[PDB]
Amino acid sequence: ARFEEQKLYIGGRYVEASSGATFETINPANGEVLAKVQRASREDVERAVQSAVEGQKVWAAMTAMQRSRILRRAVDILRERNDELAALETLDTGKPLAETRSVDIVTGADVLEYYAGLVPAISGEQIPLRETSFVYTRREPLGVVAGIGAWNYPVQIALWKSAPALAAGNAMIFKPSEVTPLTALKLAEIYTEAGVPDGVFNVLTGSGREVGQWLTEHPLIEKISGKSPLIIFPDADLDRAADIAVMANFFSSGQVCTNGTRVFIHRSQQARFEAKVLERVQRIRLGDPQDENTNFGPLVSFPHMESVLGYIESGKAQKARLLCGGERVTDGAFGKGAYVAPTVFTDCRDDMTIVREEIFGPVMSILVYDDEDEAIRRANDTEYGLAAGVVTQDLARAHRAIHRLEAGICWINTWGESPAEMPVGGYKQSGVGRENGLTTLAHYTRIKSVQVELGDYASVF
Amino acid sequence: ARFEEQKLYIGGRYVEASSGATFETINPANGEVLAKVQRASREDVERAVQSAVEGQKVWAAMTAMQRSRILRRAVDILRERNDELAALETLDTGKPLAETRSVDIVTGADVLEYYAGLVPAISGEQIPLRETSFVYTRREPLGVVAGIGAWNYPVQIALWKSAPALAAGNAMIFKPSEVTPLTALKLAEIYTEAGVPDGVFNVLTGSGREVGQWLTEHPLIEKGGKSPLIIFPDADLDRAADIAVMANFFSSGQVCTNGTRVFIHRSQQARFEAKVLERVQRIRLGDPQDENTNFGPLVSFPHMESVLGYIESGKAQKARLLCGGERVTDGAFGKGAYVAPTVFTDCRDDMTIVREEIFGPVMSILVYDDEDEAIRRANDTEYGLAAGVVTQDLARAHRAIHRLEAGICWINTWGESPAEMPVGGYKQSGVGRENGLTTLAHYTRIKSVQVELGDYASVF
Amino acid sequence: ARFEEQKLYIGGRYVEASSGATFETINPANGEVLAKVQRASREDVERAVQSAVEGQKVWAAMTAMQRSRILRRAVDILRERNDELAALETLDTGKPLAETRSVDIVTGADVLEYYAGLVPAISGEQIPLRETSFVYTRREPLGVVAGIGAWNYPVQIALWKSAPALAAGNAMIFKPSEVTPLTALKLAEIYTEAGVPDGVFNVLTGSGREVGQWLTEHPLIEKISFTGLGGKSPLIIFPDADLDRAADIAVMANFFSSGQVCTNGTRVFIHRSQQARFEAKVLERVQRIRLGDPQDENTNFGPLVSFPHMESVLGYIESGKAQKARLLCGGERVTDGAFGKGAYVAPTVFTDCRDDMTIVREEIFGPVMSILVYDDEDEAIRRANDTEYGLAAGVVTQDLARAHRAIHRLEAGICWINTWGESPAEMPVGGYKQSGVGRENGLTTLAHYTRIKSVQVELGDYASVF
Amino acid sequence: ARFEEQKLYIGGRYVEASSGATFETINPANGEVLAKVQRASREDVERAVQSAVEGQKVWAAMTAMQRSRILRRAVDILRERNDELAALETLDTGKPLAETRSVDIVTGADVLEYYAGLVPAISGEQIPLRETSFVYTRREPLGVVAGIGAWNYPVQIALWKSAPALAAGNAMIFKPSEVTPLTALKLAEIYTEAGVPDGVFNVLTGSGREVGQWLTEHPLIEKISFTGKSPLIIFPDADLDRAADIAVMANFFSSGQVCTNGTRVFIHRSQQARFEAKVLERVQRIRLGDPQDENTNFGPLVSFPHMESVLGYIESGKAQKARLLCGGERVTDGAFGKGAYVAPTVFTDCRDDMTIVREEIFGPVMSILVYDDEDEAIRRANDTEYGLAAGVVTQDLARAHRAIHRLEAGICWINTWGESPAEMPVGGYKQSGVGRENGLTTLAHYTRIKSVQVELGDYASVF
Ligand SMILES: [K+]
Ligand SMILES: [K+]
Ligand SMILES: [K+]
Ligand SMILES: [K+]
């Protein structure tokens, strides 16, 4: 009710859905209705697909450099409208302006810029077979792909998913989280203004698994779409360790997939470490995310808050020691918002629920260990295997330890800057591996292998 | 009957299954029971997994070049035993020895040889972030992976799947098709004899879907078409007929990539049919162990029954039966699963034999009037595995092939498939560097390591 | 006298050369003096080099993406000034405005845009050696490199050499051809306006081979790129060729830029049975070539680049006649009207040529096509290959097998089937460029302008045999 | 006189030179003549080239896997003949059998084995231009290339140069150092025995610069492969025992005859005394001796002229008042008098203007330089015309990382030394791994691109 009703984006313009049904997007800072948002119907999905199939033909028919300049123009518009997009994202997600202004759009534009540069670097192979025959391969666009948005980093993930897809000559239909639909629409406007052909990037808003499900079932849509340990070794700089543990747990109010929510500390260092974390947590600046001085906002929604409070209650019941936080923040204007205080449990155990399960809120679990191998064994003892980190002054030891840790992303004496080829939100590494940029593009193309026979054809018949 | 009971292969040796159950593998040339074969139980899966987990650590702890040398030793053994493995494959599958001796083991050994030489090249990336920080990557083995066998090219596909997986430092648990389980056990023996550590290549036999599911569900286990052939009016028709015949009757039509929808221009239909007929009439159907045979029985009696059902459907929908169309029962052939080479013509796009994959020796000939129409109809299908054109014109050959929607494309030939695709049959004698490297990457995972050497910054 | 004296370009501005010596650049269309141009001394080379050393440090300190942003701004400016730069190129080279306005700056900007986009992809390798030890690599700028220009595509080649050198983080000192020095200086201004730091692209003009020698001799110049690539490239027209397409290709392959192109197909092989029909088709096309004032956009064939080059070409034409080649058309200087004041040679075709003729054996770099008859395919290929040169080759045929088979048998690096003239980006030849670059060709080129630094780290114990 | 006169190896066989001239190769351990060796003439170079041209065509006509298998067969023969080849290399070079038996042939064969595996991984590209035109590229062999040998790692360098050249489908004409020509010929026989076609690897021996020049001049030779004062900076927080082990290894391995040797050793003033005592103790237990004895780890220099050159440099250091810490003379006791033995030598309190500091010596002579601060050390380290390798020793890896950024050498070591990159034809210890886009990249340098544009549409002409 703050903004006019949000409509579907198909064919370079907004169009009315065919379901007559809507949902609300709520500012988590105050419970205010930001906008009513239209639910795409199945008919509307078909409409987006046909728009996208035709649009993709125009896009693919352009030269590589033509596509590249168009995407580079979208980058420009993104950087000009950075503060405006951030403010909108802050309203929708609850994330502090200090985060959204310096991370979400910035890194998003950066990856779009990066991929735009690789568009003219997509080529195939030639393979000699014999004097009278050879093979050449062509990399062709998939056609139409679908992208499913995240609620923690809406615009960043929209950029992360659409950039390689569009760069590889595909159209994308994007469905943002129902929790956070606003910036995705803004993104689509920007693509259109930058010269991206109609239907190349359509946005379908929808709730529950339905709109996502229709994209999945549609035969013309070619493609679709942690409890990380932090081990503090005995020779760690404890100030660095506490800064890392705090950043790893409370940035974006703990709503990051790669968060280091299981913090292993050696028995001999437990007392000092707890005191240092305590000190850092007490000076966290929780507040209204529209205040530039806030560095810790409310959670993304009320139902998520209730879920986090459920986990915290689980931690108390299971006899984890509560070091700080542990409740909803309700004084002042906070009581109308979805605020959970930065929470830390210690003396945890591996069978505890707060330790086994992803919480996706500001809840750190501190676990005590006695020897190095034990800690690594326990760090690995999980279903997930997303990220891991070690803190130590001995790099030979760190080197040894990361060989033994079963995780795709490993941090040594830092945390949070995730590999550039991974569609996970938060800090992103300001540099990409050539092969990962090119391998990612390669995922959005299919290979055709053409064998040319120049000689006689042999038949056994 | 012919051979002793076949056991499970776990840990560098044969071991007893714990199901108390067996199935038979049958010689399709004469219907004799080749062997009773043990069924793996769920506990036998668990046993194979623990063996594999431990074997993989020994394997992965070796250098890439150490593994490569071992794999090359298996290559050397495979070439020595080529003829013997070929004859066994012919017993189990019915495929002519002339094929098995020159294709199945030769190309499988080739691909093992290829990955052994390529793997030590693989390195990681290093990426500076700023003066005090950098990230690097390394590719690591997945761990234990599962391989599911094909019935049409049992040992070739066993080699095609195990080669990159083993080269990349994984263990594989392999489950051959219940129709054709014999050669996969021989391959396991050969890996062991080559020096592959115990547990690195285990084989579990099983009937139906159960063993497959058990592998799929295991938490420690990490991981057809209706292809069109378009004959353009400027084609050499003799070459076209050669291509169409090979594309339909090699391995008795049991190839995934077969050109089972043959488009011919209306003005050339009559002459093309006569040329196909001349070639079909000299096909040498017979005992597949006889080196002079070039067309054997189908792989099994149930598969024969399914093909005969499709042939019945063709007649029912009034396709014109040009030749073949029945089981061959003369003399000793009536004891085998022999279906004559079969050609239907005057076919239409909506016919069941045209829409559905038969996996038997049934060619469908379709008439077109113009080139755009032939391309449109060729593309009008859910499948998209392979396609080919026959023409002598430079522009038309490339133009047409680029408009066809298939991943494997042939100009003026048929049948030799890219070496990076686990498709049985003839293989291209050449591999793209990127294709080879990419296949290897499917059997590895990337670990990214970021090191901060300076101060760490925090917003809190 | 048309333009003011042209100075050296060092440190983001024009500075005086230390000698008082100058040379002239001449408009080949009318013999007029376009400008006096200063000749650099050895001291100016030192000056330019010291400037380059320092500019390069500032340039290299930026990230690859920051460099690429700046180079993209240069691209934007080049597009803005396309017509102005083309007009100037036409004055200096005598090439038709229709060519310069659509080819020279357009493709040069294209290649700058390509390398700008490609360079931020470059990463290094990490190679584990054992549990406790690894080595990693990094690519680094060479430092200061030099480039030597060509007279036939001055600005296009200046862009071709400076684009990957600069993208990779180096500085370049460029010496354009003394025949055509004007546009290189304009390029230098444009790099500066775009934000390329002072000293990163310096231009030194000079006569003869001395400036080139001083650049080579300097110890702080890491690499020098000379190209200012001989060819006597064959075009084989097979009997099943479309003869109209073949005639079109042959004339484009011989008379574009008035025949002053490294890759030209100056030996045209025709089957004996088709010689007369093919000649008639070439002659028809040659007769409608619009030779004239290059400033007129309607002109498609200009004068040669200089009077001396014209005399050299006329010398070859005299040789062809003396050796009894049959003259099909042209064969003389064009002197009617104002053309007498310019360096104009008529489009010339000899036929009944023989492999031992001088015009067949030697590169002419002028508008002189040699037509040779053959009797079979193996003979054509053998004779096409029988030459010291191995630059380009082309075939015209409608048959799928013959097209690829003949090309596979031809010993040349640049090959064309049923076309001519669009050359690979990785080749520093002027003219039409292919609208697409192989990923590997691009990175390989970038790598020529970098060096590998290799760092091995030992985290564990060190072993000594002593 | 130990062996019969060595002839040229052209076209898979030994043939007589047409120069009428020979030179001698001398065993530096005892002064014995090993062999008279024929000098190739300009006419022999031509003969070798025409043999190479024809052989290369046979080699390139084979399938990629055929070439791969032949090169692998050569690897197996090299493993079989390791000890025999090592003994011969020891005779010719004076390098201890302990080195030659475990390093030279082992690592050479390792590199050939590596490249043999990549033969089938050579391929080109396809480049779309527009719907109606595309380009495909073919990687073809250059043809005939030349390799120039080095005297300090004869067989290893022969292997290092010939392996990618042959794997890429070229023929190579190889010219070993006149100081050490014997093993190159043995390698040539091994290639032939493995099935390499006649002419694909020819060997021409010669003295002076004649053969190398004639090869460079020859119009059918597409490429010639020819083969400083590297600093070792010991930071104040270095483990001095590690520092001393590295310094000693970096200076005295192969009797100091390695290209990448860290002959300028920078030590902080606060650590000079302790460091000197640690170097002294290690140097004193070096086992100088007959290189045929397995217990020897330090042999004579490669030749008598080289010894005299080294002794001249040692005289320069004394004359310029460098402080002699140890060694500093020819070892002449007993049998050693008949050989070319120079004691492991250490100068300290050196200065940057000293000849022994500024010039490369290629002998067992360490120059120790004192410094006061880290940036000064790094500056002085970079202040050399050369810029091959550098190393740092420190316990602070953050510091080491910063320092390698500032050091200008392209081969850098942190807390180690000696193992050079596996793409650089520099003898010695080698890194037991190669990054793909360098092995595969090196192969590319031995091929050229043929680019084929296919036009499927109308051809436009402005005329
Ligand atoms: K919301
Ligand atoms: K069977
Ligand atoms: K001029
Ligand atoms: K010697």
DSSP per residue over C303-339, as a string?
Answer: --S-HHHHHHHHHHHHHHHHTTPEEEE--SB--TGGG
Alpha carbon of B172 to ligand 2 centroid (Å): 23
For B291, the token pair is 């080196």
Count other C-beta atoms under 10 Å from residue D52's C-beta: 28
Which residues, at least 6 apart from C380, have a Cβ–Cβ distance to it below 8 Å?
A: C236, C238, C269, C374
Range 356-415 of B in CB contact (< 8 A) with C: 391-395, 397, 411-412
Which residues, at least 6 apart from A232, have a Cβ–Cβ distance to it below 8 Å?
A: A238, A241, A245, A263, A264, A265, A266, A269, A273, A390, A391
B208 is in an annotated binding site: yes
The closest CB to that of D252, out of C248, C456, C466, belongs to C466
Q: Are strands C450-458 and C133-141 parallel, antiparallel or unpaired?
A: antiparallel
Residues D288/D334, Cβ–Cβ less than 8 Å? no
Q: Are strands A201-203 and B133-141 parallel, antiparallel or unpaired?
A: unpaired
Distances (CA, A) of D187 to C378, D156, D170, D225: 40, 10, 17, 18
| Catalytic entry in C95, C99, C232, C262 | C262
The closest CB to that of C125, out of B124, B393, B394, belongs to B124
The closest CB to that of D449, out of C252, C403, C413, belongs to C413
Residue C327 bridge partners (DSSP): C350
Residues C353/C360, Cβ–Cβ less than 8 Å? yes
Which run of H or of E encompasses B231?
strand B228-231
> Distance (Å, rounded) from C-alpha C124 to C-alpha C24?
48
Q: Which residues of D are annotated as a binding site?
A: 25-26, 92, 149-152, 175-179, 208, 259, 360, 430, 433
CB-based burial of residue D1 (10 Å sphere; 0-12 exposed, 13-18 middle, 19+ buried)? exposed
DSSP state of B346: S
Which run of H or of E encompasses B203?
strand B201-203
Chains that contact B by 3+ CB pairs under 8 Å? A, C, D
Give Cα C181 distance to the centre of its chain. Answer: 15
B312 is in an annotated binding site: no
Distances (CA, A) of C186 to A93, C105, C162, D261: 52, 12, 14, 49
CA dihedral D340, D344, D349, D355 (to 10 degrees): 30
Within B168-236, residue ranges assigned H as helices are 182-194, 210-217
> Distance (Å, rounded) from C-alpha B336 to C-alpha B338?
6
At B126, phi and psi to the nearest 5?
-130, 135
Tell whether C442 is within 8 A of chain A (Cβ).
yes
For B353, the token pair is 């034999």
Preferred mutation among B67, B72, B113 to probe D, highest tally of D CBs within 10 A: B113
Ligand nearest to the CA of residue D94, numbered in listed order: 4
Tell whether D120 is within 8 A of chain A (Cβ).
no
Contact across the interface for D128 and A138, Cβ inside 8 Å:
yes
DSSP per residue over D103-170, as a string?
Answer: IIHHHHHHHHHHHHHHGGG--EEEEEEETTEEEEEEEEE-SEEEEE--SSSHHHHHHHHHHHHHHTT-
Alpha carbon of A208 to ligand 1 centroid (Å): 15
Within D253-299, residue ranges assigned H as helices are 272-284
Contacts of D63 in chain B (CB under 8 A): 429
Helix (H, G, I), strand (E, B) or coil at A430: coil
For A333, the token pair is 């204007």
Give Cα A219 distance to the centre of its chain. Answer: 26
Helix (DSSP H) and strand (DSSP E) numbers for chain B: 15, 17
Residues C128/B139, Cβ–Cβ less than 8 Å? no
At B93, phi and psi to the nearest 5?
-110, -20
DSSP state of D39: P
Contacts of D134 in chain B (CB under 8 A): 398
Residue with tokens 């190309």: B107
For B149, the token pair is 């066998």
DSSP state of D180: S
CB-based burial of residue D369 (10 Å sphere; 0-12 exposed, 13-18 middle, 19+ buried)? buried
Which residues, at least 6 apart from A47, have a Cβ–Cβ distance to it below 8 Å?
A: A10, A15
> Distance (Å, rounded) from C-alpha A123 to C-alpha B434?
11
Q: Which residue of A has its CA nearest to B404?
A: A448
Which residues, at least 6 apart from A408, have a Cβ–Cβ distance to it below 8 Å?
A: A385, A386, A387, B445, B446, B447, B448
Q: Are strands C22-26 and C33-38 parallel, antiparallel or unpaired?
A: antiparallel
Determination approach: X-ray
> How many CA within 13 A on the CB side of residue C110?
23
Which run of H or of E encompasses A167?
helix A154-167
* ∠ Cα D72 D76 D79 (to 5°): 135
Give Cα B386 distance to the centre of its chain. Answer: 14
Within C371-450, residue ranges assigned H as helices are 377-385, 400-409, 439-448
Q: How far is D289 from chain A (nearest CA, A)?
A: 38
What domains can be seen in chain B, in order of their start residue?
A: 1-225+435-460 (3.40.605.10), 226-434 (3.40.309.10)
Residue with tokens 């250059």: D142
Tell whether D277 is within 8 A of chain B (Cβ).
no
CB-based burial of residue C45 (10 Å sphere; 0-12 exposed, 13-18 middle, 19+ buried)? buried
Preferred mutation among A63, A65, A392 to probe C, highest tally of C CBs within 10 A: A65
Alpha carbon of C177 to ligand 3 centroid (Å): 9
Distances (CA, A) of B55 to B60, B66, B74, B166, B192: 9, 15, 17, 11, 12
> Distance (Å, rounded) from C-alpha B274 to C-alpha C74?
67
Helix (H, G, I), strand (E, B) or coil at C197: coil
Distances (CA, A) of C200 to C8, C169, C341: 14, 9, 40
Instruction: Please give the single-letter amino acid code of residue D36.
Output: K
Task: Indicate which residues of A carry an active-site annotation.
Answer: 161, 257, 435
Residues A126/A134, Cβ–Cβ less than 8 Å? yes
A208 is in an annotated binding site: yes
Which residues, at least 6 apart from D451, have a Cβ–Cβ distance to it below 8 Å?
A: C413, C414, C415, C424, C427, D135, D136, D137
Residue C74's closest CA among C7, C152, C166, C170? Answer: C166
Residue C136 bridge partners (DSSP): C126, C455
> Distance (Å, rounded) from C-alpha D283 to C-alpha D293?
19
Tell whether B352 is within 8 A of chain C (Cβ).
no
> Distance (Å, rounded) from C-alpha A372 to C-alpha A231?
9
Q: Which residues of C are annotated as a binding site for K(+)?
A: 25-26, 92, 179, 433, 436
DSSP per residue over C370-385, as a string?
Answer: EEEEESSHHHHHHHHH
Alpha carbon of D306 to ligand 4 centroid (Å): 11
Contact across the interface for D436 and C125, Cβ inside 8 Å:
yes
Ligand nearest to the CA of residue B302, numbered in listed order: 2
CB-based burial of residue D20 (10 Å sphere; 0-12 exposed, 13-18 middle, 19+ buried)? exposed
> Distance (Å, rounded) from C-alpha A33 to C-alpha A24?
6
Residues A66/A43, Cβ–Cβ less than 8 Å? no
> Distance (Å, rounded) from C-alpha D182 to C-alpha D25?
8
Contacts of C417 in chain B (CB under 8 A): 394
Residues A80/A106, Cβ–Cβ less than 8 Å? no
Residue B190's closest CA among B111, B97, B124, B105? Answer: B105
Residue D125's closest CA among D442, D437, D452? Answer: D452
Residue A453's closest CA among C132, B410, B426? Answer: B410
DSSP E strands in B293-351: the ranges are 320-323, 342-345
For D428, the token pair is 């010695």
Q: Are strands A33-38 and A22-26 parallel, antiparallel or unpaired?
A: antiparallel
Count other C-beta atoms under 10 Å from residue A61's C-beta: 12
CB crowding C217-233: b at 16 or more within 10 Å, else e: ebeebebbbeebeebbb
Q: Are strands D22-26 and D33-38 parallel, antiparallel or unpaired?
A: antiparallel
Torsion sign, CA atoms C160, C161, C162, C165: positive
Q: Are strands D411-414 and D389-393 parallel, antiparallel or unpaired?
A: parallel
Preferred mutation among A123, A125, A127 to probe B, highest tally of B CBs within 10 A: A127
Contacts of B132 in chain D (CB under 8 A): 398, 401
Helix (H, G, I), strand (E, B) or coil at B442: coil
Tell whether B434 is within 8 A of chain A (Cβ).
yes
Residues after which chain C has a gap (C–N > 2.5 Å): 228
Q: Which residue of B has its CA nearest to D458?
A: B395
Range 131-160 of D in CB contact (< 8 A) with C: 133-135, 137-138
> Distance (Å, rounded) from C-alpha C173 to C-alpha C146?
5
For D232, the token pair is 């070792």
Ligand nearest to the CA of residue C23, numbered in listed order: 3
Which run of H or of E encompasses C234?
strand C234-237
The closest CB to that of D397, out of B123, B399, B453, belongs to B453
Instruction: Please give the single-letter amino acid code of residue A61.
Output: A
Instruction: Please give the single-letter amino acid code of residue D401.
Output: H
> Distance (Å, rounded) from C-alpha D345 to C-alpha C170?
42
Residue C104 bridge partners (DSSP): none
Contact across the interface for B398 and D434, Cβ inside 8 Å:
no
Q: Which residue of D has its CA nearest to B120?
A: D114
DSSP state of A181: -
> Distance (Å, rounded) from C-alpha A41 to C-alpha A22?
11
A149 is in an annotated binding site: yes
Preferred mutation among B133, B252, B445, B459 to probe A, highest tally of A CBs within 10 A: B459
Residue C138's closest CA among C369, C389, C452? Answer: C452
Count other C-beta atoms under 10 Å from residue D395's C-beta: 14
Alpha carbon of A292 to ligand 1 centroid (Å): 20
Residues B100/B254, Cβ–Cβ less than 8 Å? no
